[PDB]
Design a protein around this ligand. Structure first.
Ligand SMILES: C[NH+](C)c1cc(NC(=O)CNC(C)(C)C)c(O)c2c1C[C@H]1C[C@H]3[C@H]([NH+](C)C)C(O)=C(C(N)=O)C(=O)[C@@]3(O)C(O)=C1C2=O
Ligand SMILES: C[NH+](C)c1cc(NC(=O)CNC(C)(C)C)c(O)c2c1C[C@H]1C[C@H]3[C@H]([NH+](C)C)C(O)=C(C(N)=O)C(=O)[C@@]3(O)C(O)=C1C2=O
Ligand SMILES: C[NH+](C)c1cc(NC(=O)CNC(C)(C)C)c(O)c2c1C[C@H]1C[C@H]3[C@H]([NH+](C)C)C(O)=C(C(N)=O)C(=O)[C@@]3(O)C(O)=C1C2=O
Ligand SMILES: C[NH+](C)c1cc(NC(=O)CNC(C)(C)C)c(O)c2c1C[C@H]1C[C@H]3[C@H]([NH+](C)C)C(O)=C(C(N)=O)C(=O)[C@@]3(O)C(O)=C1C2=O
Ligand SMILES: [Mg+2]
Ligand SMILES: [Mg+2]
Ligand SMILES: [Zn+2]
Lengths: 58, 209, 100, 159, 105
RNA sequence: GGUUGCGGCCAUAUCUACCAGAAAGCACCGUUUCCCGUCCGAUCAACUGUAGUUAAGCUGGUAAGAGCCUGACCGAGUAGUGUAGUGGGUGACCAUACGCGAAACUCAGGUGCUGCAAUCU
RNA sequence: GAAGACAUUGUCAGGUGGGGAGUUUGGCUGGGGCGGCACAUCUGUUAAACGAUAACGCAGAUGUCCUAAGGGGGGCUCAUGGAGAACAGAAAUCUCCAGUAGAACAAAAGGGUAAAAGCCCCCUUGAUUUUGAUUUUCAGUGUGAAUACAAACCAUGAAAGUGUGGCCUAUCGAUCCUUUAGUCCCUCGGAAUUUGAGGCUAGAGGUGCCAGAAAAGUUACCACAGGGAUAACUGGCUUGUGGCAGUCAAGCGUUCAUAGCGACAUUGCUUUUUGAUUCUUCGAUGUCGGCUCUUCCUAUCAUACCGAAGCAGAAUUCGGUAA
RNA sequence: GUGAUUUCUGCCCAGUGCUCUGAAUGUCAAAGUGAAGAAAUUCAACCAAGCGCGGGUAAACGGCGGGAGUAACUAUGACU
RNA sequence: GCCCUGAAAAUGGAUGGCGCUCAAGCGUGUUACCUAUACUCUACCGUCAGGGUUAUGAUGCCCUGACGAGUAGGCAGG
RNA sequence: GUCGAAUUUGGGUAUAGGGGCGAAAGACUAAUCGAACCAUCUAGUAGCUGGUUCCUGCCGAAGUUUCCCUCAGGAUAGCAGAAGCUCGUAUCAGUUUUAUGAGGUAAAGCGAAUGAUUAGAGGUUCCGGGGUCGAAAUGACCUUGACCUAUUCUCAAACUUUAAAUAUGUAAGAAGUCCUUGUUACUUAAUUGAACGUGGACAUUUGAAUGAAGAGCUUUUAGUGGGCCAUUUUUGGUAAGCAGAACUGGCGAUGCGGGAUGAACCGAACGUAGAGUUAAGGUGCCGGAAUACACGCUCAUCAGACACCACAAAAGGUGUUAG
RNA sequence: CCUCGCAAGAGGUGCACAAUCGACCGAUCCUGAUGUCUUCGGAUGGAUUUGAGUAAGAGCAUAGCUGUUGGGACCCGAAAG
């Protein structure tokens, strides 16, 4: 009862029938996997910048 | 035994030579590749005659040996043994395979050797004097009787086996930059060292005739 | 399918043991170790044996067969030997003497 | 019988160039990558640590993380009916810069310059690139160039 | 494989969170006590009529076992386990090998 | 323009044979008390710049030099290759149409350039 | 009359027990079986210059080994060749010169490496702890392997640095059950204390049919559901093999290649053999041979008419038109 | 089990069975005995038949191989 | 190049057939002509999209444009 | 065949289904026997076979990935329909250019490395082997190997310096560039850098082409998970309407015109009609359309007649034509 | 949507939703203040950890299409027990 093993026919047609369009980039990408040193500093720097802008705005 | 060259004729597989991956193969049937006065000089034998292919195919090693014998026998019987130099220009390196239940495990044992020949590739080359054109053409006609396919006998207008068509070889020789080696020649180039060019070619660097 | 009938001899006792199995089944194979040692003296049934440098091996019972009896005769007239010991699944036994 | 290791089919891929074996050089060690740069991945075979997979050889991505000895590169790869983002941790010997990116920076500097003058003299800018326009009307001088007639050669066999 | 009887490694104890000296032993498995809940469940399930009720393993394929070392710190008496790979032969604190000593067949 | 220290590109820099090097530098060089290191002050460590030398190292030049690099309308638009045909041929394979396009060969040229700091008739 | 607190009988426990009862008796597969593992993996090639890619394709390998063959640092250069030195020679040891790696790096193959990743020496245990992120196979799940960090504590080195096992690619394992390590932790539900038991966090004991059933056969006495997804006839495609016919002509034939043959080759035809394949047929095409009977083919055994001969006649051999 | 009558029924007790007034517990359940504990319990010895060790039995199931040298033709090998 | 020899299969037999010889064969060229559910224009049906519309239907009436194959299957209106 | 007994036979009686009985055939046990018949559990289970009921409209597949005692089946991803939702505000492309990468296949190469390999030439006062010259020679004259040097013929899926074509990654600004200065426990010798910011500048080209019959997102669920053929590349095999892959297009699921006939070839894809023009194929007649025109070749006692495609070769020919 | 502008635009507020950085709650690993009955208590502060969380609630009930599971389960069909 031997049969067909592997075939790549029609696969590209299915993919391009619903195409590969894009990974949908955004502004502010995720910080998953960046260095924790300077990630903590990023947290504190953004907190300080927000406080400074609020204090200058009054 | 002895399957046809019609079932081993076309180039269908990749070249499969004797290597560390393919051992225990039988030796070819052709062992001698130069016949006639093989120690002669290109000054002795000016005219070249080529037996050339016109199909992309595989010539059997034993077809090579059979055509080599019939050619050499005819030339030696007609014009003597020293009147020609015959060189076969294809070497059987492709190992041909034989299968010998069903198609399970169908990879076969080595059967024979064959030389893959391309279109426009010289199979036989004969150099000889100018008078022996007829006997050389007839001997290569017997050779093309015994090979498969369509072949062509062409009159090669190169001085002997080398290169450099007959006016060019003349001008080089009476210029003196050609030195007689065993069964071939050495050429003077203008790129070597002066010292060894002097001590290898004195005639060019003298005022000799 | 094919099935395998095996007839074997237990070496430590020398006893015939038989077996029957389908040829596709797995069987335990003992990892026997044969070691070539030097006999110092045949003590009270428990032969004294020597490694390449070490000298523990004082536990092997002197082999009770005619091979061990001839070994005893050899050691009694001296003629020092190296003996071959088999080790397999917890049991060890002297199997063959050999003159050095 | 069948194998898919980390470096299967990578023989000629991870070979070195001819007469280029040995130590890799300190220019490739002293070039600086900052977050947002666009880099090309071509693996160096001498440094086995930090080497990428064979899929990412000759591939372009944006660096997102810069750490002690490696950088992190985001590569889009095509599996199924979608592109996936992949975050590779590659060393600076396998990472190199992108000359398309430096030429884009020189072109934006040149464009900023050109708009700065065109605003100073009040002329329209003509900033974007145009493709190869076909040709224009031309005159060719026969003086000193009379057309030499060519004919097809006969068939002479050289062998 | 050969591993020494002593090893300076990290200690998890709260009095010593640094590298301290540890003695190296082998983990031998416990006595497999009779009053464990799985054993009581097995006894009740095997009791009666019906024969064997849970599977018993037969198709052994691996010969080796991973060795796991029990490290006891010499100061705080706290223990740890370190796993070493499949080795057929194992000697705690055998003689050290010699670089270039005279071979003796 | 040399030379030294640190380098960048990593043979246009390498290799073989032979010549030249005024100044300074570099080097060879002298000694074993100490630190130190070896079977061995040969390498290494230390002390002097004195007793000397450009013999080597190094630098540069020469070689119808080997190699390497660059270029060519030299080979060659050749081999090869996409796309097309109810094109050819028994087939093997080949030609044409629209595109892309080598390598070897031949010939010509070249034989390190440069950054920082210090020093030099 | 005999036996007698023995035996019988009642209940547990061990043995024996195909007499009997249940159940099982892998997969892939140019039919199935035997063989093999292409069933979990690794290297080169097939693989058609991103990646992916098949076959019971090719050449091989793994289920190990190592307290150093892991980590750091330092000194040196390795195969091989030449010239030499008592015994000493082809080769024992010592020098010098040349030596882009032609050696070694535990193992198969590939890659990589020269003041090292090789060979010697010194010190060590980064083969450590806490969990996260990423890559490969991928469903972007698990296992395994690996990468880069972080918080510690260390090793080494003068230091920069390097080190989270083996220079890189392989060397391996879920639930349930058992056992061990951790804090001094949670629960035993009427309230307490001790043993005991159950938990949480990390490992091990192993499933090689390797995402992981606990498992022997026979059936020609057989049965059922199916299958032309699949074998044993025929037909079909192919012609290796079988058969038949050419081409060339070294030689045999007294001399003479071709009256007749014809080696070494090489080109075809046939489906009158056996293969190869599995397209049709398993809700059925009655599957060997013989007897009987008709027709067709020609690759002519005889007969008709001819040609050639090493054809004198006779007999014979080769060929033509001919079924 | 074999299958009238006549004649004969050879060798092997290693295996598998079967058997025994063979030998010592080597292993050996429940109940019973002792030690520890606060007990649940744990660990010991003692331990029946059986298994193992020994013997017998083939008109029980069954089995009954090789390899060399060796005799005046050579060849085979009574023999070793 | 064409043609001939090589060139032998079994029911009767197949350039499709008849037939064709300065072809109705082969090679090449120039025009004319034939016709598909293809293309163009128009009409009608349906679906979709965009719109306009405050006496008897506003999920109605009307305008514009595009499109219409189809097994397994999905949905809608009857 | 047997026929005076191991004979035949009636009636009565006994043995009943895992049971009986058997001079043994797995025979017989009410036409049922390798486990009778009846009723019930029971509408037992079935990954397997068969069937599966009206119309029209719109959209419209898959035979592929991974895992499974898996290969006649499922799960999962993909392909499809429907319901939509947020915007129709600067977003994308089975495409090209410009710039920049990557690769090691075709080719090529071996007087470039590895491996194979044909042939000569010169040399080694260094005897490797065989000699000769005065048995001598740690001597000459040599042959012959070997080795080296410069050449020479042919190659290589698991060789390579070089190295295509076709496919392939990224970019072509407003989420951008430039200038001063705010935060930070990160970092620096440091008012240095890194990341994120405030403020200011950047219009008839916001920074290549062309297109957009809308872009993006989510839920749910079907069927499918046997494929097959053709051009090109290619593996095993002598080959196959053989087995297995890669790119694309088809058939399945597709009618229509042509190939006489045909699932796939050529053209062209389909609502219902009318008119016109064509594609592929054709125009002697069957058969709609020129027994058109033109230049030549061929006469076949087996002519030839149109791709897929339904066959012909080597070798010959003072047949004829041209060179 | 609002303000200015006939405009093209300039600014303000910006629900839903999308991306991201935080803040809070539970778990885990630390940190361990006042007190303390001296071993309890857990303040304050964290953390490449983690949850099917919070961050001015959306659910409940009924009905319908479709899908799932169990039931004879679309209908028919075994050899058997
Ligand atoms: C099987 N038993 C019932 C038994 C029976 C007999 N004799 C019989 O056949 C009885 N017939 C009779 C009653 C005399 C008429 C017996 O003869 C025996 C035995 C027992 C054996 C036991 C042996 C045992 N080991 C060596 C297995 C053992 O340990 C001992 C001992 N030292 O306690 C023995 O007694 C034993 O060796 C032995 O001798 C037995 C008998 O003699
Ligand atoms: C031959 N007989 C005399 C015998 C002797 C011994 N003793 C020996 O062999 C001792 N000799 C040594 C030294 C151990 C070799 C024996 O040991 C035995 C026996 C036989 C049986 C007796 C059995 C008997 N049963 C059958 C009723 C009996 O009375 C008892 C009992 N109720 O105790 C048995 O169990 C018995 O079976 C038994 O054990 C015997 C022997 O073992
Ligand atoms: C030309 N207009 C119609 C337009 C078109 C698009 N999108 C396109 O290019 C079309 N989209 C295709 C390419 C077809 C997919 C557009 O995307 C836009 C706009 C308009 C701008 C207007 C901007 C404006 N200011 C900054 C000049 C403005 O007044 C405001 C504002 N402050 O509210 C905007 O809304 C504006 O910033 C804006 O959003 C526009 C677009 O995004
Ligand atoms: C590339 N063009 C098409 C463009 C793109 C974007 N957005 C992007 O770059 C893409 N979006 C990302 C950031 C990648 C998500 C854009 O965002 C814009 C524009 C166009 C500009 C034109 C602006 C212009 N300036 C000079 C003031 C102008 O004249 C007007 C105006 N006042 O009328 C605009 O409409 C303009 O301001 C505008 O709206 C543009 C964009 O916003
Ligand atoms: Mg907008
Ligand atoms: Mg804007
Ligand atoms: Zn400790």
């Amino acid at each position: 009862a031997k049969s067909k093993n592997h075939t790549a026919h029609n696969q590209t047609r299915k993919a391009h029938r619903n195409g590969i369009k894009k990974p949908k980039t955004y502004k502010y990408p995720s910080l998953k996997g960046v260095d924790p040193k300077f990630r903590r500093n990023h947290k504190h720097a953004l907190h300080g910048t927000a406080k400074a802008l609020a204090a200058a705005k009054k | 035994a002895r399957r046809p060259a019609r079932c081993y004729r076309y180039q269908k597989n990749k070249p499969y030579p004797k290597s560390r991956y393919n051992r225990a193969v039988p030796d070819s049937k052709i062992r001698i590749y130069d016949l006639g006065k093989k120690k002669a000089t290109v000054d002795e034998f000016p005219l070249c005659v080529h037996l050339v292919s016109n199909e992309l195919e595989q010539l059997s090693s034993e077809a090579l040996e059979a055509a080599r014998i019939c050619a050499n026998k005819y030339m030696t019987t007609v014009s003597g043994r020293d009147a020609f130099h015959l060189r076969v220009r294809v070497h059987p390196f492709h190992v041909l395979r034989i299968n010998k239940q069903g198609m399970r495990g169908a990879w076969g044992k080595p059967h024979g050797l064959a030389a893959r020949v391309d279109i426009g590739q010289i199979i036989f080359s004969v150099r000889t004097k100018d008078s022996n054109k007829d006997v050389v053409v007839e001997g290569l006609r017997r050779a093309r009787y015994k090979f498969p396919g369509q072949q062509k006998i062409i009159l090669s207008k190169k001085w002997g086996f080398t290169n450099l068509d007959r006016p060019e070889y003349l001008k080089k020789r009476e210029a003196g930059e050609v030195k007689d080696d065993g069964a071939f020649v050495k050429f003077l180039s203008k790129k070597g060292s002066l010292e060894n060019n002097i001590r290898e070619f004195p005639e060019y660097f003298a005022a000799q005739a | 399918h094919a099935k395998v009938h095996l007839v074997a001899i237990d070496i430590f006792t020398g006893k015939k043991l038989e077996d029957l199995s389908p040829s596709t089944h797995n069987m335990e194979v003992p990892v026997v170790k044969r070691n070539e040692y030097q006999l110092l003296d045949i003590d009270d049934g428990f032969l004294s044996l020597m490694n390449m440098d070490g000298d523990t091996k004082d536990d092997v019972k002197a082999p009770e067969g005619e091979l061990g009896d001839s070994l005893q005769t050899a050691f009694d007239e001296g003629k020092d030997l190296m003996v071959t010991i088999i080790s397999a699944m917890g049991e060890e036994a002297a199997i063959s003497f050999k003159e050095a | 019988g069948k194998s898919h290791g980390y470096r299967s089919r990578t023989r000629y891929m991870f070979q070195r160039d001819f007469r280029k074996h040995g130590a890799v050089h300190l220019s490739t060690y002293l070039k600086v990558y900052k977050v947002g740069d666009i880099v090309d991945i071509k693996a160096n075979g001498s440094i086995q640590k930090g080497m990428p997979h064979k899929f990412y050889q000759g591939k372009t991505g944006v660096v997102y993380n810069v750490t002690k000895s490696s950088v992190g590169v985001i590569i889009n790869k095509m599996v199924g009916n979608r592109y996936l983002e992949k975050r590779l941790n590659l060393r600076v010997e396998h990472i190199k810069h992108s000359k398309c990116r430096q030429e884009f920076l020189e072109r934006v500097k040149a464009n900023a310059a050109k708009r700065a003058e065109a605003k100073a003299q009040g002329v329209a800018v003509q900033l974007k690139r145009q493709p190869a326009q076909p040709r224009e009307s031309r005159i060719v001088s026969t003086e000193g160039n009379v057309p030499q007639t060519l004919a097809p050669v006969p068939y002479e066999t050289f062998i | 494989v050969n591993v020494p009887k002593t090893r300076k490694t990290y200690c998890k104890g709260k009095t010593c969170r640094k590298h301290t000296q540890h003695k190296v032993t082998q983990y031998k498995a416990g006595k497999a006590s009779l009053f464990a809940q799985g054993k009581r469940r097995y006894d009740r399930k095997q009791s009666g009529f019906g024969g064997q009720t849970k599977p018993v393993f037969h198709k052994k394929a691996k010969t080796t076992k991973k060795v796991v070392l029990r490290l006891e710190c010499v100061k705080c008496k706290t223990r740890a386990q370190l796993t070493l790979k499949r080795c057929k032969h194992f000697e705690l604190g055998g003689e050290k090998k010699q670089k270039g000593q005279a071979l003796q067949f």
